[PDB]
Design a protein around this ligand. Structure first.
Ligand code: CLA
Ligand code: CLA
Ligand code: CLA
Ligand code: CLA
Ligand code: CLA
Ligand code: CLA
Ligand code: CLA
Ligand code: CLA
Ligand SMILES: CCCCCCCCCCCCCCCC(=O)OC[C@H](COP(=O)(O)OC[C@@H](O)CO)OC(=O)CCCCCCCCCCCCCCC
Ligand SMILES: CC1=C(C/C=C(\C)CCC[C@H](C)CCC[C@H](C)CCCC(C)C)C(=O)c2ccccc2C1=O
Ligand code: SF4
Ligand code: SF4
Ligand code: SF4
Lengths: 88, 30, 143, 146, 743, 157, 80
C-alpha cells in the first residue's frame, strides 16, 4: 500500500532512487593506496586549517614573488609621467 | 612589496576566513 | 462529547497520474497532512496542486503537503459537491493529530463545548500605549 | 536564544533564510532584543559610542598614514597650486599596462589616486609640514582608538 | 449541423435611457458612486463583457458589434490620412522629386508661436514631415492627383458609416445566434478563401491594371499629369501593350496554360528595382496572384453543408501519442466556448506576425522610394515591433483569464492542458535556469568587455580583434541565400534580399538603400541579449498563466480572481501573485526587450547600412562603421549611441524639430512620474487624503463622492502605463529628431 | 500505452517518471557514479570525483586565463585550478562541519525504491563527509597535476 | 506564530471563520450580542497571516486583529 502509518519513509517517498548498494568496483591495493595517502586529509577541522593556512601562505608567496613579466602592477610604469590638466 | 602581501591578505584570505567563520556561527545549533 | 474518527490507512486514494505539485522532503522529516471524505460516486475534481483527479466512489484518502491545501480542497468538496470531509496532521513518527472539523461541528457554527482563546473584553481602541508595556515582555494586545 | 541571532528567540526559531537577514538588520535595535532592560539599553549605547569613536580615530589615523607613506604632502607644500595630492597607491593585479601608466601621476613611482577630500590643504593650514608630523599624528590617533 | 444564417430580431431596444445611467452594465456600478473608486471601476469593467453577463450569446453579440465599432474608427482614421494627403500635403511635388522633397501631410495653425513646426519640407511647402509612409503607398498604387486621394477619403468615410451602421444593426436588429458564431469551419473557410484570397486577387488586379503601368510612366520620367489615367489602361489595351505587350493576347494564354508568355509583367526576379529601391512590382503582382490561389485552395479544407472536407474536431482527436495521452481531445469544445482562449491565440499569432512584418519590410522594401527614406523606415520597424510586443503580452493576459474563468476539468477537459498543469513546476524551473544562463552568457560578456577595456586590456575582450564569437550559423545561412538564385531557385534572378547576396549595393539619390549586412561578435552578443530578454518575458507570462489557478503558496488562488492585489502580508507576504500582476511585470520586460531591439536596429543600420555614396561609389555610413568596435561594451552604448545620437533632439529648439525636443523632455517627465506610483502604496496616499479632506470639510467644500486613493491594482496599472508611455515616447522623440536631421 | 507515470507508483509524491528520470540506461549510469555507491567508503568516491573534476578544471583556466597567450606561463596557469580545488575543498569541509555533528547517524534514505530496508550511505555522516572531502582534495590536486603533465600532441594545448 | 485576537465589539456574524483558509477561528457561545456568539482563535499556530478575516469583519473598528509575529514553517505557508 502507498499509505502506511507504520512506514512513513515509504509513505512519504523517502527512497534512494539511484543508489547502487552494490559492493566496491574499486579493486584493493588501489583502495589501500588512496586510503593510506588521503588519510591525513580526512579530519575535517584539520583539513580546514591546512587549506586556509596552506592556501593563504601559498597565495602570499605567489603574490610576493610575482614578476613584472606577469603582472603590469609589479613592472610599474615604463613611460615618462604625463602632465595634469593644470598641475603635475 | 607590502601591497603585494596585504592586498591579497584583506581581499582574498580575510574575506574567505570571515565568510567561512560567519557561515559556521550562523549555521550552528545549540 | 465528540470522538474523532481515527485515520484508517488502506483507505483508497483518488485516481490521478501524478504531478510536480505533491509532497517533498518536508513530508518525510517534518509533517504532512491527510484529508478523507466520502463520495457518492466517481467524479472529476480539481486537485489543489496538480490538475484533475478522479474522486472514487466511497471513502477517499488524500495526503497533502500543507493544512491549507486540505482546507481548500475540503471547502470545494463541501461547496461544488456536497461532501463531508475530515483532515489530520501526520508527523514522521506515525503519530496522527485530528484537526478538522475539530468538534465534529464546522467552526462557523457555534458549538457549546468551545472555550474562548485570544478574546479581549474591550474595544480595540482601549489597548494601552507601547510605553506602558515597555521593558516588559508583554504586548498591549496580549492583555 | 539557542542560535543566531542570540538576542531574538523569535528570529532564531525561524527555519527560513529570513532568520539570517533579520538577524543583521535588527542587531542595533536594542529596545527590541530579548530580556532588554533600561540599564542594558543605556550601557550598550554608551559602549557603542566608544566603539564609534575608536572607528573614527582609526580611520583618520589610516588617512594620515597613507598620505605620509604614499602621498605628495612634502612636495605639495612647496607648490600648492601645481601638485595633485595623492590619496594612496593602487596595487591592483587586474591592471593592464595602460592602467599602470595612466594612473601613475602626481609625481609618484606607480599608479595612485588623486585625493579629493582636501586633507592636504587642511593639514598644511594647521601647521603640519613633514611626513614625520603625519606619522606622529597617525600613531597618536591609533592610540586614541585603542 | 446544417450551416445557415441565424439571427434574432430586436434583442436590445435602441434608447438613450441607459446612456443616462452610468454603469448600467454592472449591477453594482449602476447603483452609482459612494466613493471615487466607482469612477475608476466604471472604466475598467466597461469592455469586460463576460463579467457583465454569463450568457455566451449576449457576449458574442457585444463582441461582434464592438468589432464593427473598431472598423468604423479605422475607416475614419484612413479617411483622415487620405484627406490630409489630398488637402494638406505636398504629395504631388514629392511625386515629382521623391529623392529630395520630404513628405509632409500635416500643417499647423499660426496661433501661439507653433508655426515654427511648419518647416521647409521642399516643394514650396511648410509643414510637419511624416514618417508613416503613405506617400510611398500612394505612389505604389498609381495614385497621382490629390483628387484621387479625396475620392479615397470619401469612400473610407462611407465605409466608416457602413461599419458603424452594421454594428448597430447586428446588436439591435438582426443579432446572430450563438450557433452562427460557433460555425468555425464556415468562418475559417470564408476568411481563408473569401477574405484573404479574393482580397489578394483583387489587389493583384489593381496592380496589373493600375500600379504597374502608372509606375512604368513614373519610372520613365513622365510627368504625372501627363500620365494616362488608370482606367485608360483598362479601355485602350494599346497603352498597356506598349508598356506590357502580353495584354494583346486577351487572356487566352491563361486558359490555354501558356502562362510563361506572361513572364513580361509577372516575374520572379527578386531583389530591388535600382531606380526606386523598392521590390519589383511585377514580382509583387505575381506574388498576390500566387497567394490568392493558395488561400482560395485553403478555404475548402473544412466541411460545412456538403459532406466533403474536414471536421476540425475529428482532426484534433486523431492527434495523440504515447507522451501526451489523449491530447487535443476537448480543444474544439474549449475553442468554441471561450472568447478569451481565441483572443489569446490570435493575439499571440497577430503580434508575432507584426514583428515578422517589421523585419521583412526593412530587408525587402516593398514600396518605391521607401528604403532611402530612413525616417519612414526606422519609424515603421520601431512601430511594428511595439505593436507586436504589446499584442503578445495581451495573449498572456487572456490565456490567464481563460485559466481563471473558463477552465473547468469536470466539464471541458483537455489532456494536454492537464499534463502541462501537472508538471508546471518542472516547466517554470527549467525556464528560470535558462534565463539565468542567458543573462550571464549574454550580458555578463558585455560586463567582461567593459571591465577589460577600462583596465587597458582590449586584447582580453570579446571582440572581432580579440576573442571572436562569430555567428557562424547565421553567416552560413545568409551565404546560402546569396547562392540560392540560379541554384536552389533557378527562377530567381537575384538574391531574395540584398542583405544576403554580396555586392549589388542599391543607391537612390546618392543615398544607399540596401547592401550586404555584415555579422560579427557584436551581432552575436546582441542576439543573445534578444534571446535572454525574450526568455525572461516568456518566463514571467507563462509562470503567470500556469500558476493562475493555484500554487503551493495559495491553493485556492483561482477563487481570488484574475485581477487581485494580493492575499495579504502573510505566508511571508503574497503581493503580486495574481496572473494580472504577472502581466504587469511582463509589460516591463517587453519594454526592455523591444527597446534593446530597436536600439540594435538604429545602431546597426546607421553604422553598417545607411549612408551616402560617391559618384565613384565610395560609401560613407551615417556613423563610421563603429558598431563592431563600440557596441560590444555598455559604455559604448552610453557614449557612441545615446550621448552621440541624442544631440539632434537636444539641439532641436528653434527649428521645426523642436516638438521632438519638447516630447523628449515631457516623456522623461511622465516616465519619472510613474515611479511615484510604482514605488509607493495606497495606504500612505489615503492617510494624506484624510488630512486634505479635513481641510475641505473645514470650508464646507468636501465632496459627497468621497475621495479615495487608487486601488493597489490601479496603482500598478497607472504606474506601468506611464512608465511605458514615457519610455516609448522618449525613444520616439529621440529617433525621429535623429533620423529626420541626419537622414 | 503512455510513457509518463507517477514516481514509484505514488501519484501524490511530487515528481514524475520519464525516460529522463527512470530509464535502464539512466538508472545504471547514475547508479555507477561514485556519489551513488552507498556501500563504498566515501574516501574512495571522493578520490574518483576529485580526480575527474580536478582533471577537468585545467582546461578553461589555461586556455581562457589572462596568461593564456604567454605560453611560458600560460601552461602553468593550472595553479589556478589547484586553487579552485582548495576553495572547493574548504566549501566541502564547512558544509560537512555545518551539516553533520560528531555522533549523528546518516541522513541518507534507508529504503530502496522497491520498499526493502537499506543501509544508509555514510557519506551523510560527519566522518563520512570528512573522508569524502579529503578524498576530493587528494584526487583533485592529483587530477590537476595529471592534466598539467600532458602538454603535448593535443589539438588544443 | 502570529497572534490573533477577538474584541468584544464582535457581533458574531461568523464571517471571519468563514474567510479563514487554515481554520484558526471558531464561534463560541457568549451573551454580549444578539447572535449570542463571539469569535475565537484557538489554532493560531496554523495562522498564515493573510488577514482575510480582517477583510471580512463588518465592525468599526475591527473585532479580529492579526498581529504578525514570529515566523514558522506554517506561518510562511511553506510546502517544503
Ligand atoms: C579584492 C581581492 C582580489 C585579489 C587580490 C584578486 C587577484 C587576482 N585575480 Mg580576482 N576577483 C576578485 C578579487 C580579487 N582578485 C573579485 C571580487 C572578483 C569578482 C568580480 C574577481 C574575479 C576575477 C576573475 C574572473 C579573474 C581574476 C583574476 C585574478 C588574478 C589576476 C592577476 C594574475 O593574472 O595573476 C596570476 C594568474 C594566475 C592564474 C595565478 C594563480 C594564483 C594562484 C593559484 C594563487 C593560489 C590561490 C590560493 C592557494 C587559494 C586562495 C584562497 C585562500 C584564501 C585559501 C589575480 C591574482 C584572473 C585569474 O585569476 O586568472 C584565472 C581572472 O580570471 N579575478
Ligand atoms: C582604518 C583606516 C584605514 C583604511 C580605510 C585603510 C585602507 C587601505 N590600506 Mg591601510 N593601514 C591602516 C589603516 C587603514 N588603511 C593602519 C592604521 C595601518 C597601520 C599603520 C595600516 C597599514 C597598511 C599597510 C602596510 C598597507 C595598507 C594598505 C591599504 C590599502 C589596501 C587594503 C589593505 O591592504 O588592507 C589594510 C592593511 C592593514 C594592516 C590595516 C589594519 C591596520 C589597523 C589595525 C586597522 C584595524 C583592522 C581591524 C583588525 C579590523 C577593523 C575593521 C576596520 C574598521 C579597520 C587600502 C586602501 C596596503 C596598501 O597600501 O596597498 C596599496 C598596505 O600595504 N595599510
Ligand atoms: C445610434 C444610437 C444608439 C443608441 C441610442 C444605443 C443604445 C444602447 N446601446 Mg448601442 N450600439 C450602437 C448605437 C446605439 N446604441 C452602435 C452604433 C453600435 C456599434 C458599436 C452599438 C453596439 C452596442 C453594443 C455591443 C452594446 C450596446 C449597448 C446599448 C445600451 C447601453 C447604453 C449605452 O450604450 O451606453 C453607452 C454610451 C456611450 C457614449 C458609448 C460610447 C462608445 C463609443 C462608440 C466609443 C468611441 C471611441 C472613441 C472615439 C475613442 C477615443 C477616445 C479618445 C478621445 C481618448 C443602450 C440602450 C450595450 C447594452 O446592450 O447594454 C446592456 C451593449 O453591450 N450597443
Ligand atoms: C546617530 C545616528 C543614528 C543612530 C544611532 C540610529 C539608531 C537606530 N536607528 Mg536610525 N537613522 C539614522 C541615524 C541613526 N540611527 C539616519 C541618518 C537615518 C536615515 C538614513 C535613520 C533611519 C532609520 C530607520 C528607518 C530605522 C532606523 C532604525 C534604528 C535603530 C536600529 C538600527 C538597526 O539595528 O539596524 C541595523 C543596520 C544595518 C544592518 C545597516 C545595513 C543597511 C545599510 C543601510 C546598507 C549600507 C549601504 C551600503 C552597504 C553601502 C556600501 C555600498 C558599496 C557598493 C560600497 C537604532 C536604535 C530602525 C529601527 O529600529 O526603527 C525602530 C529603523 O527602522 N533608523
Ligand atoms: C467571404 C465572406 C466574408 C468576408 C469577406 C468576411 C470579412 C470579415 N469578417 Mg467575417 N464571417 C464570415 C464571412 C466573411 N467575413 C462567415 C461565413 C462567418 C461565420 C458565420 C463570419 C463571422 C465573423 C465574425 C464573428 C467576425 C468576422 C469579422 C470579419 C472582419 C475581420 C476584420 C478584417 O479583416 O477587416 C477587413 C475589412 C474589409 C475587408 C472591408 C470589407 C468588409 C466588407 C464591407 C464586408 C464583406 C463581407 C460581408 C460579410 C458581406 C455581407 C454584407 C451583406 C450581408 C450586407 C472582416 C471584414 C469580425 C468582424 O465582424 O469585424 C467587424 C468578427 O468579429 N466574421
Ligand atoms: C484586440 C486585443 C484585445 C482585446 C479585445 C482585449 C480585451 C480585454 N482585455 Mg486585454 N490586453 C491586450 C489586448 C486586448 N484586450 C493587450 C495588447 C494587452 C497588453 C497590455 C492586454 C492586457 C490586458 C490586461 C492586464 C487586462 C486586460 C483586460 C481586458 C478586458 C477588459 C477591457 C476593458 O474594459 O478595459 C478598459 C479600457 C481602458 C480602461 C483604457 C485604459 C487607457 C489606457 C491604459 C491608456 C492608453 C494610452 C494611450 C493609447 C496613449 C496616451 C493617450 C492619452 C494621453 C489620452 C477585455 C475583454 C482586463 C481584464 O480584466 O480582463 C477581463 C485586464 O486586467 N487586457
Ligand atoms: C539593471 C536592473 C536589473 C537587473 C540587474 C536585474 C536582474 C535580473 N532579473 Mg530583474 N527586474 C528589473 C531590473 C533588473 N533585473 C526591474 C526594474 C523589474 C521590475 C519590472 C524587474 C523584474 C524582474 C522579474 C519579474 C524577473 C526578473 C528576473 C531577473 C533575473 C534574470 C536572470 C538572469 O539574468 O540572471 C543573471 C544575472 C544577471 C544578468 C545580472 C548581472 C550579473 C553580473 C554581470 C555578474 C557578476 C557576478 C560577480 C561575480 C559578482 C560577485 C562580486 C562579489 C563581491 C559578490 C536577473 C538576475 C527574472 C528571474 O527571476 O530570473 C529568471 C524574473 O522573473 N526581473
Ligand atoms: C533546402 C531548402 C530549399 C528551399 C527553401 C527552396 C525553395 C524554393 N525552391 Mg528549391 N531546391 C532545393 C532546395 C530548396 N529550395 C535544392 C537543394 C535543390 C537542388 C539543387 C532545389 C532545386 C529547385 C528547382 C529545380 C526549383 C526550385 C524552386 C524553388 C522555389 C519554388 C518552390 C517550389 O518549387 O515548389 C515546390 C516543389 C515541389 C516539387 C513540391 C515539394 C513540396 C515542398 C516540400 C513544399 C522556392 C522558393 C523552383 C524555382 O526555381 O522557383 C523559381 C524550381 O524550379 N528548387
Ligand atoms: C521544436 C523542438 C522541440 C522538440 C521537442 C521534442 C518533441 O517534439 O517530442 C514530442 C513528444 C511526443 O509526444 P506525443 O508523441 O505524445 O505527441 C502526439 C500528440 O501530442 C500530437 O498529436 O512530446 C513530448 O515529448 C512532450 C514534450 C516534452 C519535451 C519538453 C522539452 C522542451 C525543450 C525544448 C526547448 C529546447 C529547443 C528549443 C529550440 C527552439
Ligand atoms: C500619487 C498616488 C496616488 C494619488 C493619486 C491619485 C488619487 C490620482 C487621482 C488624481 C486626479 C487628479 C483626481 C481626479 C479629479 C477629477 C478628475 C476632478 C478634476 C476637476 C477638473 C480639473 C476636471 C494614489 O492614490 C496611489 C495609490 C496606490 C499606489 C500609488 C499611488 C500614488 O502614487
Ligand atoms: S503590502 Fe499591499 S500588495 Fe503587499 S501584501 Fe500587503 S496589501 Fe498586499
Ligand atoms: S490572518 Fe488568515 S489564517 Fe490568520 S486567522 Fe485571519 S484569515 Fe485565518
Ligand atoms: S467578522 Fe468581526 S463581528 Fe464577525 S464574527 Fe468575526 S470578529 Fe465577530
Amino acid at each position: 500500500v502507498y499509505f502506511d502509518l507504520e512506514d512513513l519513509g515509504n509513505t512519504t517517498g523517502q527512497w534512494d532512487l539511484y543508489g547502487s548498494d552494490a559492493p566496491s568496483p574499486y579493486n584493493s591495493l588501489q583502495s589501500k593506496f588512496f586510503e593510506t595517502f588521503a588519510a591525513p586529509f580526512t579530519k575535517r577541522g584539520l583539513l580546514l586549517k591546512f587549506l586556509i593556512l596552506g592556501g593563504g601562505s601559498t597565495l602570499a608567496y605567489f603574490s610576493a614573488t610575482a614578476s613584472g613579466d606577469i603582472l603590469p602592477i609589479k613592472k610599474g610604469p615604463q613611460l615618462p609621467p604625463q602632465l595634469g590638466p593644470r598641475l603635475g | 612589496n607590502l601591497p603585494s602581501l596585504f592586498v591579497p591578505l584583506v581581499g582574498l584570505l580575510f574575506p574567505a576566513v570571515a565568510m567561512a567563520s560567519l557561515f559556521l556561527h550562523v549555521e550552528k545549533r545549540l | 462529547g465528540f470522538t474523532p474518527p481515527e485515520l484508517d490507512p488502506n483507505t483508497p486514494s483518488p485516481i490521478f497520474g501524478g504531478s510536480t505539485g505533491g509532497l517533498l522532503r518536508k513530508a518525510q522529516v517534518e509533517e504532512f497532512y491527510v484529508i478523507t471524505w466520502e463520495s457518492p460516486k466517481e467524479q472529476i475534481f480539481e486537485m489543489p496542486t496538480g490538475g484533475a483527479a478522479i474522486m472514487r466512489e466511497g471513502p477517499n484518502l488524500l495526503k497533502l503537503a500543507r493544512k491549507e491545501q486540505c482546507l481548500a480542497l475540503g471547502t470545494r468538496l463541501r461547496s461544488k459537491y456536497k461532501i463531508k470531509y475530515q483532515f489530520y496532521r501526520v508527523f514522521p513518527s506515525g503519530e496522527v493529530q485530528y484537526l478538522h472539523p475539530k468538534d465534529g461541528v464546522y467552526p462557523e457554527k457555534v458549538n457549546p463545548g468551545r472555550q474562548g482563546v485570544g478574546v479581549n473584553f474591550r474595544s480595540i481602541g482601549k489597548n494601552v500605549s507601547p510605553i506602558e508595556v515597555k521593558f516588559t515582555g508583554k504586548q498591549p494586545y496580549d492583555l | 536564544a539557542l542560535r543566531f541571532p542570540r538576542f531574538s528567540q523569535g528570529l532564531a526559531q525561524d527555519p527560513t533564510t529570513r532568520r539570517i537577514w533579520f538577524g543583521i538588520a535588527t542587531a542595533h535595535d536594542f529596545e527590541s532584543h530579548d530580556d532588554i532592560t533600561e540599564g542594558r539599553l543605556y550601557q550598550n549605547i554608551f559602549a557603542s559610542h566608544f566603539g564609534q569613536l575608536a572607528i573614527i580615530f582609526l580611520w583618520t589615523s589610516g588617512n594620515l598614514f597613507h598620505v605620509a607613506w604614499q602621498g605628495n604632502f612634502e612636495a605639495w607644500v612647496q607648490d600648492p597650486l601645481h601638485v595633485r595630492p595623492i590619496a594612496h597607491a593602487i596595487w591592483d593585479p587586474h591592471f593592464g599596462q595602460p592602467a599602470v601608466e595612466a594612473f601613475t601621476r602626481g609625481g609618484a613611482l606607480g599608479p595612485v589616486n588623486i585625493a579629493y577630500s582636501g586633507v592636504y590643504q587642511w593639514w598644511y593650514t594647521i601647521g603640519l609640514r613633514t611626513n614625520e608630523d603625519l606619522y606622529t599624528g597617525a600613531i597618536f590617533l591609533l592610540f586614541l582608538s585603542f | 449541423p446544417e450551416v445557415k444564417i441565424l439571427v434574432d430580431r430586436d434583442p436590445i431596444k435602441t434608447s438613450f435611457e441607459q446612456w443616462a445611467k452610468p454603469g448600467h452594465f454592472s449591477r453594482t456600478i449602476a447603483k452609482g458612486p459612494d466613493t471615487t473608486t466607482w469612477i475608476w471601476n466604471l472604466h475598467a469593467d466597461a469592455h469586460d463583457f463576460d463579467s457583465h453577463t454569463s450568457d455566451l450569446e449576449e457576449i458574442s453579440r457585444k463582441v461582434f458589434s464592438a468589432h464593427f465599432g473598431q472598423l468604423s474608427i479605422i475607416f475614419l482614421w484612413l479617411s483622415g490620412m487620405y484627406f490630409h494627403g489630398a488637402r494638406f500635403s505636398n504629395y504631388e511635388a514629392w511625386l515629382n522629386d521623391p529623392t529630395h522633397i520630404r513628405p509632409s501631410a500635416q500643417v499647423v495653425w499660426p496661433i501661439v508661436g507653433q508655426e515654427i513646426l511648419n518647416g521647409d519640407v521642399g516643394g514650396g511647402f511648410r509643414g510637419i514631415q511624416i514618417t508613416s509612409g503613405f506617400f510611398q503607398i500612394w505612389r505604389a498604387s498609381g495614385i497621382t492627383s490629390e483628387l484621387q486621394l479625396y475620392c479615397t477619403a470619401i469612400g473610407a468615410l462611407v465605409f466608416a458609416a457602413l461599419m458603424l451602421f452594421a454594428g448597430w444593426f447586428h446588436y439591435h436588429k438582426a443579432a446572430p445566434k450563438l450557433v452562427w458564431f460557433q460555425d468555425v469551419e464556415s468562418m475559417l473557410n470564408h476568411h481563408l478563401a473569401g477574405l484573404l484570397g479574393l482580397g489578394s486577387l483583387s489587389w493583384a488586379g489593381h496592380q496589373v491594371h493600375v500600379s504597374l503601368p502608372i509606375n512604368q510612366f513614373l519610372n520613365a520620367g513622365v510627368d504625372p499629369k501627363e500620365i494616362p489615367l488608370p482606367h485608360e489602361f483598362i479601355l485602350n489595351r494599346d497603352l498597356l501593350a506598349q508598356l506590357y505587350p502580353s495584354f494583346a493576347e486577351g487572356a487566352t494564354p491563361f486558359f490555354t496554360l501558356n502562362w510563361s508568355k506572361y513572364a513580361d509583367f509577372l516575374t520572379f526576379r527578386g531583389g530591388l528595382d535600382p531606380l526606386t529601391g523598392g521590390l519589383w512590382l511585377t514580382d509583387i503582382a505575381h506574388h498576390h496572384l500566387a497567394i490568392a490561389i493558395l488561400f482560395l485552395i485553403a478555404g475548402h479544407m473544412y466541411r460545412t453543408n456538403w459532406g466533403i472536407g474536414h471536421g476540425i474536431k475529428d482532426i484534433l482527436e486523431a492527434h495523440k501519442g504515447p507522451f501526451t495521452g489523449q491530447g487535443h481531445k476537448g480543444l474544439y469544445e474549449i475553442l468554441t466556448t471561450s472568447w478569451h482562449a481565441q483572443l489569446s491565440i490570435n493575439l499571440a499569432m497577430l503580434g508575432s506576425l507584426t514583428i515578422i512584418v517589421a523585419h521583412h519590410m526593412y530587408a525587402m522594401p516593398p514600396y518605391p522610394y521607401l528604403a532611402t527614406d530612413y525616417g519612414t523606415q526606422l519609424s515603421l520597424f520601431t512601430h511594428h515591433m511595439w505593436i507586436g510586443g504589446f499584442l503578445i503580452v495581451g495573449a498572456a493576459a487572456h490565456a490567464a483569464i481563460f485559466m481563471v474563468r473558463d477552465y473547468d476539468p469536470t466539464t471541458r477537459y483537455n489532456d494536454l492542458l492537464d499534463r502541462v498543469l501537472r508538471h508546471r513546476d518542472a516547466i517554470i524551473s527549467h525556464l528560470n535556469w535558462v534565463c539565468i544562463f542567458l543573462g550571464f552568457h549574454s550580458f555578463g560578456l558585455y560586463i567582461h568587455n567593459d571591465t577589460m577595456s577600462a583596465l587597458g586590456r582590449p586584447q582580453d575582450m570579446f571582440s572581432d580583434t580579440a576573442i571572436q564569437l562569430q555567428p557562424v550559423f547565421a553567416q552560413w545561412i545568409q551565404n546560402t541565400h546569396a547562392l540560392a538564385p540560379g541554384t536552389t531557385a533557378p527562377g530567381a534572378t537575384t538574391s531574395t534580399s540584398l542583405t544576403w547576396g554580396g555586392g549589388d549595393l542599391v543607391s537612390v539619390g546618392g543615398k544607399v538603400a540596401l547592401l550586404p549586412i555584415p555579422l560579427g561578435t557584436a551581432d552575436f552578443l546582441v542576439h543573445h541579449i534578444h534571446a535572454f530578454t525574450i526568455h525572461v518575458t516568456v518566463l514571467i507570462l507563462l509562470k503567470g498563466v500556469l500558476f493562475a489557478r493555484s500554487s503551493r503558496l495559495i491553493p485556492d488562488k483561482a477563487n481570488l480572481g484574475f485581477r487581485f492585489p494580493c492575499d495579504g502580508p502573510g505566508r511571508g507576504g503574497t503581493c503580486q501573485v495574481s496572473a494580472w500582476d504577472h502581466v504587469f511585470l511582463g509589460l516591463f520586460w517587453m519594454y526592455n526587450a523591444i527597446s534593446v531591439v530597436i536600439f540594435h536596429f538604429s545602431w546597426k543600420m546607421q553604422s553598417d547600412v545607411w549612408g551616402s555614396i560617391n559618384d565613384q561609389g565610395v560609401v560613407t555610413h551615417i556613423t563610421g562603421g563603429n558598431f563592431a568596435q563600440s557596441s560590444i561594451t555598455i559604455n559604448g552604448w552610453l557614449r557612441d549611441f545615446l550621448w552621440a545620437q541624442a544631440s539632434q533632439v537636444i539641439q532641436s529648439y528653434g527649428s521645426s524639430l523642436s516638438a521632438y525636443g519638447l516630447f523628449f523632455l515631457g516623456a522623461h517627465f511622465v516616465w519619472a512620474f510613474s515611479l511615484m506610483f510604482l514605488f509607493s502604496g495606497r495606504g500612505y496616499w489615503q492617510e494624506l487624503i484624510e488630512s486634505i479632506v479635513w481641510a475641505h470639510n473645514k470650508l464646507k467644500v468636501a465632496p459627497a463622492t468621497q475621495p479615495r486613493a487608487l486601488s493597489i491594482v490601479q496603482g500598478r496599472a497607472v504606474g506601468v502605463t506611464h512608465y511605458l508611455l514615457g519610455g516609448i515616447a522618449t525613444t520616439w522623440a529621440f529617433f525621429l529628431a535623429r533620423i529626420i536631421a541626419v537622414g | 500505452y503512455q510513457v509518463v507515470q507517477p514516481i514509484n507508483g505514488d501519484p501524490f509524491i511530487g515528481s514524475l517518471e520519464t525516460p529522463v528520470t527512470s530509464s535502464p540506461l539512466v538508472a545504471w549510469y547514475l547508479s555507477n557514479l561514485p556519489g551513488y555507491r552507498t556501500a563504498v567508503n566515501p574516501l574512495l568516491r571522493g578520490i574518483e570525483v576529485g580526480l575527474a573534476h580536478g582533471f577537468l578544471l585545467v582546461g578553461p583556466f589555461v586556455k581562457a586565463g589572462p596568461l593564456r597567450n604567454t605560453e611560458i606561463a600560460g601552461q602553468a596557469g593550472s595553479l589556478a585550478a589547484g586553487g579552485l580545488v582548495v576553495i572547493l575543498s574548504i566549501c566541502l569541509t564547512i558544509y560537512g562541519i555545518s551539516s553533520f555533528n560528531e555522533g549523528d547517524p546518516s541522513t541518507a534514505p534507508s529504503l530502496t525504491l522497491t520498499g526493502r530496508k537499506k543501509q544508509p550511505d555514510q557519506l551523510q555522516t560527519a566522518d563520512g563527509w570528512a573522508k569524502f572531502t579529503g578524498g576530493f582534495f587528494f584526487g583533485g590536486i592529483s587530477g590537476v597535476i595529471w592534466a598539467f603533465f600532458l602538454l603535448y600532441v593535443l589539438d588544443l594545448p | 506564530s502570529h497572534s490573533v485576537k477577538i474584541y468584544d465589539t464582535c457581533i458574531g456574524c461568523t464571517q471571519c471563520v468563514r474567510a479563514c483558509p487554515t481554520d484558526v477561528l471558531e464561534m463560541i457561545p457568549w451573551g454580549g450580542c444578539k447572535a449570542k456568539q463571539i469569535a475565537s482563535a484557538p489554532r493560531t499556530e496554523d495562522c498564515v497571516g493573510c488577514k482575510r478575516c480582517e477583510s471580512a469583519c463588518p465592525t468599526d473598528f475591527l473585532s479580529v486583529r492579526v498581529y504578525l509575529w514570529h515566523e514558522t514553517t506554517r506561518s510562511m505557508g511553506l510546502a517544503y
